[PDB]
Amino acid sequence: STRPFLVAPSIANSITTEAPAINHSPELANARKWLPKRCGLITRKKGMMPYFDKSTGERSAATILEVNNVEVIMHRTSEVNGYFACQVGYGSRHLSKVSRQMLGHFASKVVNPKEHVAEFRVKDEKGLIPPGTLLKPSFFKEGQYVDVRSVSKGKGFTGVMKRYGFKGLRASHGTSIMHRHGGSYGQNQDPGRVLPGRKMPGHMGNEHVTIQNVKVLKVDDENNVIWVKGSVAGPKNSFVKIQDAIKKT
Amino acid sequence: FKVRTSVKKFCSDCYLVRRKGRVYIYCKSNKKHKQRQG
Amino acid sequence: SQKIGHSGLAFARLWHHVDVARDKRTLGRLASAIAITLIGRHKPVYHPSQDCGDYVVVTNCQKIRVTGKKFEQKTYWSHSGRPGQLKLQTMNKVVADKGFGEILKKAVSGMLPKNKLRKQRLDRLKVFDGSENPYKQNITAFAHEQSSIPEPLKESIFNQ
Amino acid sequence: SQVGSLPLYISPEVQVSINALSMPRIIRKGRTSMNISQNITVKGPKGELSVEVPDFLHLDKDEKHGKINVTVQNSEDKHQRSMWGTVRSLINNHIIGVTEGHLAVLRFVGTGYRAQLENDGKFVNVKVGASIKQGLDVPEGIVVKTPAPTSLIIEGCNKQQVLLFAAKLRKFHPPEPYKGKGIYVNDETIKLKDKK
Amino acid sequence: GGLLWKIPWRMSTHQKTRQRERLRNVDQVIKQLTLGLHVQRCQDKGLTYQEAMESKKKYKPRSKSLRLLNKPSVFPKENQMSSKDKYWTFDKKAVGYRKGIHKVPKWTKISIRKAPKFF
RNA sequence: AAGCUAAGUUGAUAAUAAAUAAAUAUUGAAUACAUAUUAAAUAUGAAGUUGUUUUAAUAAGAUAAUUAAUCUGAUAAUUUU
RNA sequence: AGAGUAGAUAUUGUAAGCUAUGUUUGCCACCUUCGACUCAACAUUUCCUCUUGGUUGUAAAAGCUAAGAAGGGUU
RNA sequence: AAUAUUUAAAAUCAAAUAUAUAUAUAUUUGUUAAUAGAUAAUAUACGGAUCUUAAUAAUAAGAAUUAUUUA
RNA sequence: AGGUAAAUAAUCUAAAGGGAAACAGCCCAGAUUAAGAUAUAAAGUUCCUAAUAAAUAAUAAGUGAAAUAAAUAUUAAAAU
Numbered sequence A: 001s002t003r004p005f006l007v008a009p010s011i012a013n014s015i016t017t018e019a020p021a022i023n024h025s026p027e028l029a030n031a032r033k034w035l036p037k038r039c040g041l042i043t044r045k046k047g048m049m050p051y052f053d054k055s056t057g058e059r060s061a062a063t064i065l066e067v068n069n070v071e072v073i074m075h076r077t078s079e080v081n082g083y084f085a086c087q088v089g090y091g092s093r094h095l096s097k098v099s100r101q102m103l104g105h106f107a108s109k110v111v112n113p114k115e116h117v118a119e120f121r122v123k124d125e126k127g128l129i130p131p132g133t134l135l136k137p138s139f140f141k142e143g144q145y146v147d148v149r150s151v152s153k154g155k156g157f158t159g160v161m162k163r164y165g166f167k168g169l170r171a172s173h174g175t176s177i178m179h180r181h182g183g184s185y186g187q188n189q190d191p192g193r194v195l196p197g198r199k200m201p202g203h204m205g206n207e208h209v210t211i212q213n214v215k216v217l218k219v220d221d222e223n224n225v226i227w228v229k230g231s232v233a234g235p236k237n238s239f240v241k242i243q244d245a246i247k248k249t
Numbered sequence B: 001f002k003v004r005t006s007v008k009k010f011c012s013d014c015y016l017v018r019r020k021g022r023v024y025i026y027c028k029s030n031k032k033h034k035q036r037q038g
Numbered sequence C: 001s002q003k004i005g006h007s008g009l010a011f012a013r014l015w016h017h018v019d020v021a022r023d024k025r026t027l028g029r030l031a032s033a034i035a036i037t038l039i040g041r042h043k044p045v046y047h048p049s050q051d052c053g054d055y056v057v058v059t060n061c062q063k064i065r066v067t068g069k070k071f072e073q074k075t076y077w078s079h080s081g082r083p084g085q086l087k088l089q090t091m092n093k094v095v096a097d098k099g100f101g102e103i104l105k106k107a108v109s110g111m112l113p114k115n116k117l118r119k120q121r122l123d124r125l126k127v128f129d130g131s132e133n134p135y136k137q138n139i140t141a142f143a144h145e146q147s148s149i150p151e152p153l154k155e156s157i158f159n160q
Numbered sequence D: 001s002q003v004g005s006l007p008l009y010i011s012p013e014v015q016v017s018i019n020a021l022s023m024p025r026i027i028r029k030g031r032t033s034m035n036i037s038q039n040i041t042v043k044g045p046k047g048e049l050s051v052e053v054p055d056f057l058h059l060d061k062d063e064k065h066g067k068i069n070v071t072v073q074n075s076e077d078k079h080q081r082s083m084w085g086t087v088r089s090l091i092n093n094h095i096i097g098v099t100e101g102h103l104a105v106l107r108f109v110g111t112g113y114r115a116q117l118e119n120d121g122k123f124v125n126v127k128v129g130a131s132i133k134q135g136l137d138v139p140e141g142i143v144v145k146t147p148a149p150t151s152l153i154i155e156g157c158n159k160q161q162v163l164l165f166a167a168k169l170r171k172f173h174p175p176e177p178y179k180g181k182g183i184y185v186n187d188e189t190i191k192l193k194d195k196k
Numbered sequence E: 001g002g003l004l005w006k007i008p009w010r011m012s013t014h015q016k017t018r019q020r021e022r023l024r025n026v027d028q029v030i031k032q033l034t035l036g037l038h039v040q041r042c043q044d045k046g047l048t049y050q051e052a053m054e055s056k057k058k059y060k061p062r063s064k065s066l067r068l069l070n071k072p073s074v075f076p077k078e079n080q081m082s083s084k085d086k087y088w089t090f091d092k093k094a095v096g097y098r099k100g101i102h103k104v105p106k107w108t109k110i111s112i113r114k115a116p117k118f119f
Numbered sequence F: 001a002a003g004c005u006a007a008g009u010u011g012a013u014a015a016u017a018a019a020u021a022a023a024u025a026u027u028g029a030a031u032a033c034a035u036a037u038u039a040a041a042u043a044u045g046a047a048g049u050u051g052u053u054u055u056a057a058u059a060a061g062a063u064a065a066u067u068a069a070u071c072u073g074a075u076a077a078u079u080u081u
Numbered sequence G: 001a002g003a004g005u006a007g008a009u010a011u012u013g014u015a016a017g018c019u020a021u022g023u024u025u026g027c028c029a030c031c032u033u034c035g036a037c038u039c040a041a042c043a044u045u046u047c048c049u050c051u052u053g054g055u056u057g058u059a060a061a062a063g064c065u066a067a068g069a070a071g072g073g074u075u
Numbered sequence H: 001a002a003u004a005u006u007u008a009a010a011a012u013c014a015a016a017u018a019u020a021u022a023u024a025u026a027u028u029u030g031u032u033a034a035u036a037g038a039u040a041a042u043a044u045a046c047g048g049a050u051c052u053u054a055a056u057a058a059u060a061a062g063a064a065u066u067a068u069u070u071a
Numbered sequence I: 001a002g003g004u005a006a007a008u009a010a011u012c013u014a015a016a017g018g019g020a021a022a023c024a025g026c027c028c029a030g031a032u033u034a035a036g037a038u039a040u041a042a043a044g045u046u047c048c049u050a051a052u053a054a055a056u057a058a059u060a061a062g063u064g065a066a067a068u069a070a071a072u073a074u075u076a077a078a079a080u
């Protein structure tokens, strides 16, 4: 009845011993990490406008981050995925735009075809929100601090003056044909090569930018927007993550 | 501490110790007599 | 005349277990022993032009012997190319990062011949800090050895 | 050798046993080695406490006169001989602790230099010239008590642990030479400098 | 000293064994030379080869150089020689007044058994 | 006016934690004393180290769909985020 | 040796002794551009910042001297 | 145990070889170690891996350093 | 001084081969053309890399492991 199999004595008679835990494991990394105790929500940077504090009278530039169909699609767990995180989805999209596979995924998770999906990593299993629920601006409290991630404005192929604040050469006094240049880019032979990461002209902007400890000036579920003190990376209609500030409480 | 190659005990109250692969001379009376071998 | 026949068995890649808990060799000597196996010098059919070396599964690698104070002194180096980026890690630190198996692998790599087959040979080495491993089922075995092993242990191994 | 040869006296209430460990550990030197197998215990009135010890050492319990001896398999082996004098001394200290108890008086010296039991004995608050509050938790086994504010007493079964704790307490402010001022553990002295 | 003559200050075990073997060979050669002369002299007197080989009283060589070589005070055997004189020459300009024999040029051919009494 | 900009605006100088350096100790022999140990045990300790934080790269893993009246991409057009 | 109110070794350290460095001025002859601007990378023999030993010459505060320390900074 | 030198086979003793030979004479050989001192600039730099051992327990490892040797 | 000036010997010069990591001059050894069984030289024999097993001591410092760094200091060890 049983299948034919031979087993080595060396592998059978080996005394059982568990492996020690390693730093470059997922679980150790998770333990190390500095993470927020609560989920976040995806937003769109609609624009920017003044916020007048009515008690003091102080004016503050505030960016208006709109919150539309923001929904916990699913979430990830340490036993399956190696970490705790809430996959949030923002907005509504047409059928036409979304891939068949993506549509099927959304149907399975029981949400509308979504405009932008993103994870929100958390410390514990307690931080996970039940899936399918709708996240509104009232999630955050007025006066609380939040970290803000988004892709910055694209600046194109930039020079070393704009990239790195290089002084450049003089305007007059003989200076020929190199007014905005980086000057020397290395050393004669010793190295015999431009060493890695030598600040040179290149593409700038259109990279992710976390902005830490920004104050939530105002929250209102009526207009579907979170007011946030100061600037946020990227152009208008750019997607903006928002989670509680790890540094500030 | 006088960090030096030569490390002799000065007074009777000085005592030599061997720690961390270095000869230390501590002293119970005079604190100036503290020495270390390199 | 000697060469003529069925050569398939000669060039067969066997799988060699080594329970490091049982083995009494120090790290470097063990690595050297492994290297030969990995190359295929042990087998008489060997030729330098042909890779014909066996698999080596190392297990219970946490109990590997290291003499002197090498565990807290011996430094493993690394360098990208950009100056001021020399990464020097002590043996214990390396172990903490990855394991004792990583350490063994490095030794074995250094033992091996420096050419296009080296990487392949290194890959064939399968090291494990503790006991449990997937290759348990594929170590070379014989029917005459089966009486030594108790009845239910074999079944448990098969299940695993 | 000269220490280890000295026999230990025991009173009927105290029992010095010995037995093998559950999982013996081996200390590996450069050339020599040292396998910790046995585990001596000193049970008594005030408490009980143990010493993990090498294999080469073993007791010699005599019924008559309450004496026990300690010997090693090779006294001419240097490391063994060194261990022998240590272990005997340790078990003597344990005996002393279980029967009588070890003590460590700290006297505070200075204007507004004093100790206080803050967490019902579990945290010795120490005020010794600092804006920030200073102190540390008492370990298990250690019992602290304060007859005066400026005179604290630490008490325990382990001579090692109590005196370590005392040293830690002192470390907040050791005695200054200019004014005999700080925290003095037991009979501690300091040569006071001329004022000038 | 920009050019690198990477010669070690001391010899390996295998080098030392080879040196010893070489020393032994020169002693053997000398012995053979004396023996052959003795045999020849026996033959001249009127003995057979075998008889000469058997002979109790072996004839010592009359020529000067051979006689000197035979003397151990002048030319010692490898078994007689000190450990030091096998592996170290006298070099007055070196520290220790000593230098490895392997540092001598053509040391494999050139012989040098006897060092000075206190150097 | 838009845009772009700094003279302008907003934020950050990335914790907690772990092991250490010099240095400071506990018990304690070898060596009747002494000795923080270049002995066994037990503790403190740095703008440094490990990390943490941030960016870029990679893609283990995960959800879903699976020869298609509208599967997934590209070529094409109108464009700019 | 000698200064250091006293005490060579807190701090100082003649002339002579033993080394390291390849930062100066030379010597050799294998080998036939100083400064400014710009951007700097590396070292540590540390100037500042952090930790610490000594300082009848650390009361305090400023110092002096020594050990660890190249993270950040250094018109 | 303590004090103070020396680190030596010249003397001395021991061992071996050669001449008369159970002895004498002559010759040859045998007398410390570790650490600190310790040190710059593209990057660790024994050529590299790596080498220092361990009972239970292996048909099995235990310098791959230094010194004197053997097969 | 990898300096300079000559004395003696060798090699290079004009010499390929093995060793010395790489190498004009060092250690071996001199290519007429092959063959590859046997003796080998210098140098080696854990792996990279052709080839190894032992004995007696010492080191614990990775000292050292084919390019030996000094006076002096400390700790031992022998002999008197």
Ligand SMILES: [Mg+2]
Pocket: A171
């Ligand atoms: Mg300008």
Ligand SMILES: [Mg+2]
Pocket: none
């Ligand atoms: Mg112009």
Ligand SMILES: [Mg+2]
Pocket: A188
């Ligand atoms: Mg140029």
Ligand SMILES: [Mg+2]
Pocket: none
């Ligand atoms: Mg600003």
Ligand SMILES: [Mg+2]
Pocket: none
């Ligand atoms: Mg910080």
Ligand SMILES: [Mg+2]
Pocket: none
């Ligand atoms: Mg005592």
Ligand SMILES: [Mg+2]
Pocket: none
């Ligand atoms: Mg003490």
Ligand SMILES: [Mg+2]
Pocket: F046
């Ligand atoms: Mg810190």
Ligand SMILES: [Mg+2]
Pocket: G002
């Ligand atoms: Mg004077």
Ligand SMILES: [Mg+2]
Pocket: none
């Ligand atoms: Mg002078």
Ligand SMILES: [Mg+2]
Pocket: none
């Ligand atoms: Mg420094």
Ligand SMILES: [Mg+2]
Pocket: none
């Ligand atoms: Mg002060």
Ligand SMILES: [Mg+2]
Pocket: G071
């Ligand atoms: Mg840091």
Ligand SMILES: [Mg+2]
Pocket: H009
């Ligand atoms: Mg003599």
Ligand SMILES: [Mg+2]
Pocket: none
């Ligand atoms: Mg270097």
Ligand SMILES: [Mg+2]
Pocket: H047
């Ligand atoms: Mg080599």
